[PDB]
Amino acid sequence: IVEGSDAEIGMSPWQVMLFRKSPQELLCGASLISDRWVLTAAHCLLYPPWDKNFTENDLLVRIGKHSRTRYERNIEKISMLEKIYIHPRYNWRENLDRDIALMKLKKPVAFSDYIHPVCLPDRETAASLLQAGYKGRVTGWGNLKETGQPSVLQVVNLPIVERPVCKDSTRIRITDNMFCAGYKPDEGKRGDACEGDSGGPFVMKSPFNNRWYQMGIVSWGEGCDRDGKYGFYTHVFRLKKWIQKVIDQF
């Protein structure tokens, strides 16, 4: 995350780190949506153009974390993967349409002060909150700039941007399963996600019921925190039939 700030303790309890084994490194962000299911971006697991193709056994899930590098004994919990499900119409070839994956954990994780699931929006939540100008929140252990890395989880709050502006910021085809967010050049505040933050959550706090909903998944941008560019997020509500199918089936 570029131009954010250090998270508070327990500020993002659904935050997950995807952690590569052999070699030990940050793979991606992700989020906790129940005691056995974790949500991330498909391209954190499968991306042929960068020769990324991780299988269950390649990674661990680290939940409860704050420090990027430390093993947070008695706080964090570390989970193994049962199975990965990638959206069947994930579009890695063109534009990262449907950039979404789910991971079933081998054992349920216990909830704690540090470990707690986020809500997924229903239709009404999305219609109420996914509006130009409304801010959500992005968190991750990713790069502090485009071209270093944080001691602790980073947070930034960023406004949802109008679709035409999103579209006019890039030559890539923007679909209805994406939204973008970020400040404009004349706005005089900054912030973005960056390398290592993909997969993590864009959340909003409902003013109706005071619950946090994960409206987006950190997907891609052209660089990090570049004037005139924005972050692209996977639209969680538009993919929720898939999500619900996977969890009800498996």
Binding site: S5, E8, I9, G10, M11, P13, I33, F111, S112, D113, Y114, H116, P117, V118, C119, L120, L129, G133, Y134, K135, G136, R137, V155, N157, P159, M204, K205, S206, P207, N210, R211, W212, Y213
Partner: peptide
């Protein structure tokens, strides 16, 4: 049932330092 309510914040009616920024945007 208890999704999206943070044990150290909402559960204890404590606010984090910038959530009000979000709320103010929801105009």
């Amino acid at each position: 049932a208890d999704c999206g309510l943070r044990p150290l914040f909402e559960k204890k009616s404590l606010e984090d330092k910038t959530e009000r920024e979000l709320l103010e945007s929801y105009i």
